[PDB]
Amino acid sequence: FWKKIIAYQQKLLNYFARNFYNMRMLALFVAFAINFILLFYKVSTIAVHYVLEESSGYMEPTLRILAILHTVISFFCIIGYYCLKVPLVIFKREKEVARKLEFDGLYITEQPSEDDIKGQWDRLVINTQSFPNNYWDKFVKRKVMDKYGEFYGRDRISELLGMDKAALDFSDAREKKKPKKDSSLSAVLNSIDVKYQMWKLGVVFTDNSFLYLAWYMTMSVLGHYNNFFFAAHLLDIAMGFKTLRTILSSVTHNGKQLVLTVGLLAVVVYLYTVVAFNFFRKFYNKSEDGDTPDMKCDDMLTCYMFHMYVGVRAGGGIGDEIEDPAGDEYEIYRIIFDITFFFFVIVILLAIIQGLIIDAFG
Amino acid sequence: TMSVLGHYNNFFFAAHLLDIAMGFKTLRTILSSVTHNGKQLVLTVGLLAVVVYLYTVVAFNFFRKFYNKSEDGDTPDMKCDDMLTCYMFHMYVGVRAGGGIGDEIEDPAGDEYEIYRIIFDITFFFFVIVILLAIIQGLIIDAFG
Amino acid sequence: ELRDQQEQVKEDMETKCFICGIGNDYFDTVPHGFETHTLQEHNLANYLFFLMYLINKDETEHTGQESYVWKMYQERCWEFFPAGDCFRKQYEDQLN
Amino acid sequence: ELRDQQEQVKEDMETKCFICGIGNDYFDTVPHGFETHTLQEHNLANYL
Amino acid sequence: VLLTNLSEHMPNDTRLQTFLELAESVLNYFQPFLGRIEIMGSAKRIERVYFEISESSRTQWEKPQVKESKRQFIFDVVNEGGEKEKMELFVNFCEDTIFEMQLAAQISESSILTVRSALFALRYNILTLMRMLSLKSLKKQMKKVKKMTVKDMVTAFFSSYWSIFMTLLHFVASVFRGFFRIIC
Numbered sequence: 035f036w037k038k039i040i041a042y043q044q045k046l047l048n049y050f051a052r053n054f055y056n057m058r059m060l061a062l063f064v065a066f067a068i069n070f071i072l073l074f075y076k077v078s079t080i081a082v083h084y085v086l087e088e089s090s091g092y093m094e095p096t097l098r099i100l101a102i103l104h105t106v107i108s109f110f111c112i113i114g115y116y117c118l119k120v121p122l123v124i125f126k127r128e129k130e131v132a133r134k135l136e137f138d139g140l141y142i143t144e145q146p147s148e149d150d151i152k153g154q155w156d157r158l159v160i161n162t163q164s165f166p167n168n169y170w171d172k173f174v175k176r177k178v179m180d181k182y183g184e185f186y187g188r189d190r191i192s193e194l195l196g197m198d199k200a201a202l203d204f205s206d207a208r209e210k211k212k213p214k215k216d217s218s219l220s221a222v223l224n225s226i227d228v229k230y231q232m233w234k235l236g237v238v239f240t241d242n243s244f245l246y247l248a249w250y251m252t253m254s255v256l257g258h259y260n261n262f263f264f265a266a267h268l269l270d271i272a273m274g275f276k277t278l279r280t281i282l283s284s285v286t287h288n289g290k291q292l293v294l295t296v297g298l299l300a301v302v303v304y305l306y307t308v309v310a311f312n313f314f315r316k317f318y319n320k321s322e323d324g325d326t327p328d329m330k331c332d333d334m335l336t337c338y339m340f341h342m343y344v345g346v347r348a349g350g351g352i353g354d355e356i357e358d359p360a361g362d363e364y365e366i367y368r369i370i371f372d373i374t375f376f377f378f379v380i381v382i383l384l385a386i387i388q389g390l391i392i393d394a395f396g
Numbered sequence: 397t398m399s400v401l402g403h404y405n406n407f408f409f410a411a412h413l414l415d416i417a418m419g420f421k422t423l424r425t426i427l428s429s430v431t432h433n434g435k436q437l438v439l440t441v442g443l444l445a446v447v448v449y450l451y452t453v454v455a456f457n458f459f460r461k462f463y464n465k466s467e468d469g470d471t472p473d474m475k476c477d478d479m480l481t482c483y484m485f486h487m488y489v490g491v492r493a494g495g496g497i498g499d500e501i502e503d504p505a506g507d508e509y510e511i512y513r514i515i516f517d518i519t520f521f522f523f524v525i526v527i528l529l530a531i532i533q534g535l536i537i538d539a540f541g
Numbered sequence: 542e543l544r545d546q547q548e549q550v551k552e553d554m555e556t557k558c559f560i561c562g563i564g565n566d567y568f569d570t571v572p573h574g575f576e577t578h579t580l581q582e583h584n585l586a587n588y589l590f591f592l593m594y595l596i597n598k599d600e601t602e603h604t605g606q607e608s609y610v611w612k613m614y615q616e617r618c619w620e621f622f623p624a625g626d627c628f629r630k631q632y633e634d635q636l637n
Numbered sequence: 638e639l640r641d642q643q644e645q646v647k648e649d650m651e652t653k654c655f656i657c658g659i660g661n662d663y664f665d666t667v668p669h670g671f672e673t674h675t676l677q678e679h680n681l682a683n684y685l
Numbered sequence: 686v687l688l689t690n691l692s693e694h695m696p697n698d699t700r701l702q703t704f705l706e707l708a709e710s711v712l713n714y715f716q717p718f719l720g721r722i723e724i725m726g727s728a729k730r731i732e733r734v735y736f737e738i739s740e741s742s743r744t745q746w747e748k749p750q751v752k753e754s755k756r757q758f759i760f761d762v763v764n765e766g767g768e769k770e771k772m773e774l775f776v777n778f779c780e781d782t783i784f785e786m787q788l789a790a791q792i793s794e795s796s797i798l799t800v801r802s803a804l805f806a807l808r809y810n811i812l813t814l815m816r817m818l819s820l821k822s823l824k825k826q827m828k829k830v831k832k833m834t835v836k837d838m839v840t841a842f843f844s845s846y847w848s849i850f851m852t853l854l855h856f857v858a859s860v861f862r863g864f865f866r867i868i869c
C-alpha cells in the first residue's frame with residue numbers, strides 16, 4: 035500500500051524533474067501565442083467592454099484554452115523546479131552550514147551578525163536529526179564535537195547540535211528494541227522531522243528562482259481575470275534565450291554607473307532649473323492664446339518637471355521649447371544658458387551612457 | 397534573370413547595384429562591421445519590438461484618451477482604440493520620433509494621470525530611444541574593434 | 542583608456558614583484574612561491590614599516606645593518622633596495 | 638587604434654633594445670642593467 | 686627573531702625544526718610583529734633584516750584611507766612612472782604615509798528589525814502550513830484513499846504544491862505589510 039503509493043509519487047516527481055525545462059519553454063511558447071492573439075483586441079463602447087474581433091470566429095475559445103494551458107504549465111513548472119532544483123539548493127546550503135560549523139565555529143566561537151537573514155535562519159537546522167540529509171558528510175556533528183567539545187563543554191556542544199548521549203550509551207550497552215512497521219500512519223507522522231522541513235521550506239521560500247516562478251504563476255492566474263496580464267510573461271525571454279543575455283549584460287554590466295549617470299543628469303538639470311527660475315521666468319510661457327498664460331517656471335517643482343520632461347527629450351535642449359531671446363537685455367546670458375544645456379545634457383551625458391554600453395561590450 | 401527583366405522594365409537594372417558588395421573588397425570591411433554581429437542586431441530589434449508591445453499594452457489599457465491625432469474636432473482619429481492599430485502607431489511613430497511617443501501623443505498637463513504618463517514617456521525615451529539604439533551602435537563599434 | 546590603465550596596473554602587480562621586479566614564473570617553481578615572496582620577503586608594507594622603525598629608533602641604538610641603511614637613506618641612495626636579485630636567487634643552489 | 642599603436646611603441650621601447658633586440662630580462666640580472674645597456678652600450682644616439 | 690633567523694638561514698636542520706615545534710606558541714604570538722625585508726648589504730650580498738612592527742602602526746596601515754592612498758600611489762607609479770624614479774617615489778610615499786599614520790595615532794585618544802520581521806513572517810506562515818499537515822486527523826482522507834486511485838493521488842500531489850504556493854503568497858503579503866508598518 036504505502037510502498038506502491040510512494041513508488042507512484044516518486045515516478046511523478048521524476049517525470050516532472052525530467053520535463054522541467056521542456057515545460058519551461060512550452061510556457062514561453064504559449065505566452066507568445068496568447069499575446070499574438072491579444073494583438074487583435076478592440077474596445078467597444080457607460081463602461082467600455084474590451085472585445086476580441088476575428089473573421090474566423092475561432093480565436094475566442096482558443097484564448098481561454100491557451101490561458102488554462104498556460105496556468106497548468108506554470109503550476110507544472112513550479113512542481114518541476116521543486117523536484118529538480120530544490121535538492122541542489124538544499125545540498126549547497128547544508129554544505130555551507132556544515133563547513134561554517136566545523137572550520138569557523140559560526141555557532142560556537144562567534145555568532146551570526148544579527149542582520150544576516152540566512153545566518154539567523156540556519157540555527158534551526160543544527161538541532162535537527164535529519165542534518166546532512168542531502169550533503170554526504172554525515173559525520174559533521176562528530177567532527178564539530180571532536181574539535182570544540184573539550185574547550186566549550188561536551189554536554190553544551192551536544193545540546194547545541196541536538197545529539198543525545200544517553201540513548202547512544204544505552205544502545206551501545208544492553209538495548210532492547212521492538213520494531214514498528216512503516217505502514218502505520220501514526221508511525222510515519224512521528225518519523226517525519228517537522229523542524230527540518232520547516233527550515234527547508236524557509237530556504238525554499240527565500241530562494242530567488244522559486245520566488246520568480248511563483249510570480250510567474252501568480253501572473254498566469256491573474257491573466258484569467260484580465261487577459262492583458264499575460265503580457266508580463268513576455269519578460270521571460272531574458273531567461274528563455276541565452277543570446278539575449280549577452281545583449282542584456284551589455285547594459286547590466288555597468289548598471290550602477292548607468293543609474294549614477296541619470297542621478298548626475300537630474301542634479302545638473304536641477305541646477306539649470308534653479309538658474310532659469312531665478313533669471314529666465316519670462317521665457318517659459320507655453321500658451322498660444324494671449325488671454326490665458328501657461329507659465330511653466332513660476333513654481334520650482336513645475337519648472338523642474340518641465341525641464342526634466344521636455345528639455346532632455348528635445349533634440350536641441352530647452353531652447354527648442356522656450357521662446358526666442360532676440361531683442362532682450364538677457365539675450366547673451368540666455369544663449370549661453372541654452373548652448374551649455376545642449377552641450378552638457380544632450381551631448382555629453384547621453385554620450386556617457388553610450389560609452390558605458392560600448393565599454394561593457396568591449 | 398534581373399538583367400533579362402531589365403529589358404521589360406529598365407528599373408530592374410538597379411538591382412545590379414547590390415553587386416558592389418562583391419565587387420569591392422574595401423566595402424566588405426564596412427559590411428562586415430554590420431554582418432559580424434547580425435544575429436545580435438536582429439535579436440536587439442526583436443527585444444525592441446517586445447518592449448514597444450509592452451508599452452502599447454500599457455497605453456491601450458490606461459492612456460487611450462491621449463491618442464487622438466485629428467486636428468478637426470468633428471472626426472476623431474483615435475490611434476489606440478485597437479490593439480493592432482496602437483502597436484503599429486507606437487512602432488512606426490514613437491520609435492522614429494526624437495523624444496519618443498510623447499512627442500506625438502498630446503500633452504498630459506491638468507490630468508489625474510499626469511505623473512503616470514510623464515513616467516511612461518520618460519521611460520519610453522530612456523529605454524527605447526536611448527538604450528536600445530545605443531546597443532545597436534555599440535554592436536557595430538564592437539564589431540569594428 | 543582608463544579601463545586599460547586599470548588592467549595594466551592589475552597585470553603588472555600580479556606578474557612582477559614591486560621591489561625586485563622578478564617575474565612570477567621564477568618564484569612559482571615552488572608552490573605559492575610568488576605569493577610567499579611578495580607577502581613575506583619583498584613586502585612594500587614591510588619596507589614602509591622598516592622605514593618607520595628606522596626613523597623612530599635612536600641613531601645610537603642602530604645595528605650595523607640599520608646604520609648602513611640609515612646612512613644610505615640620509616644620502617638618498619637607493620642601492621640597498623634589491624633590484625633584480627633576492628635571497629632565493631642568491632642562495633638558489635643551497636636553498637634548493 | 639592610435640592609442641593602441643602608441644602603447645605598442647612604448648611597450649616595445651621599454652621591453653627590448655632598439656639595436657640588438659635583446660629583452661630587458663637578460664640585462665636586468667644586473668641592477669639597472671637594461672637602462673645602462675640602452676643608454677651607454679647600444680645607444681641609437683651614439684650610433685648616429 | 687633569533688629563532689626565525691636561524692630557521693631561515695638553516696632551512697634543512699631537523700634539530701632546529703624540533704625547537705620550532707617546541708616554540709610554535711611564542712612564534713605564533715610574535716608573528717604579526719616580526720618585520721622581514723631583504724636588502725643588498727655592505728658585503729655585496731642580499732641580506733634579510735628582521736625588525737619590530739607595532740600594533741598601532743599595523744592598525745594605521747590597515748585603515749581604509751591609507752589603503753586608498755596605497756592604491757592611488759601604485760596606479761600612478763605603474764602608469765606614469767619610470768624605473769629610475771620608482772624607488773624615490775616609493776620612499777616619498779612611505780614618508781608621507783608614515784607622517785599621516787603617526788598623526789592619526791596621535792589624534793586617536795585612548796535593517797535588524799526588517800530582518801526580524803521577515804524571520805517572524807517565515808516562522809508564522811510555515812507553522813500555519815505545518816499545522817494542516819500535522820493535524821493527525823487525516824483519517825478522513827485515508828477514508829477516501831483506502832483504494833488506490835490514480836486521479837485522486839495525482840490530485841493530492843498537485844494540491845500539496847498548491848498549498849505551498851498559497852503559503853508563499855501569504856508569506857510575501859505578510860512581509861510587505863510588515864515593511865509598510867516599519868517604514869510608516
Ligand SMILES: Nc1ncnc2c1ncn2[C@@H]1O[C@H](COP(=O)(O)OP(=O)(O)OP(=O)(O)O)[C@@H](O)[C@H]1O
Nearest residue numbers: 554555557558559560575576579583584585586752
Ligand atoms: N612588493 C610587493 N608587495 C606586495 N604585494 C605585491 C608586491 N609585488 C607584487 N605584489 C602583488 O600585489 C598584490 C597585492 O595587491 P595590492 O597591493 O593592490 O593590495 P591588496 O592586498 O590586494 O589590498 P586590499 O587589502 O585592499 O585587498 C598581490 O597579488 C601580490 O602578489
Ligand SMILES: Nc1ncnc2c1ncn2[C@@H]1O[C@H](COP(=O)(O)OP(=O)(O)OP(=O)(O)O)[C@@H](O)[C@H]1O
Nearest residue numbers: 650651653654655656671672675676679680681682
Ligand atoms: N637603443 C636604444 N637607445 C636608446 N634608448 C633605448 C634603446 N633601446 C631601448 N631604449 C629605451 O627607450 C627609452 C628612451 O625613450 P625615447 O627613445 O623615446 O626617448 P627619451 O630619452 O625618453 O626622450 P625625451 O628626451 O624627449 O624624454 C628608454 O626606456 C630606453 O631604455
Ligand SMILES: [Zn+2]
Nearest residue numbers: 558560561583
Ligand atoms: Zn621581490
Ligand SMILES: [Zn+2]
Nearest residue numbers: 654656657679
Ligand atoms: Zn642592445
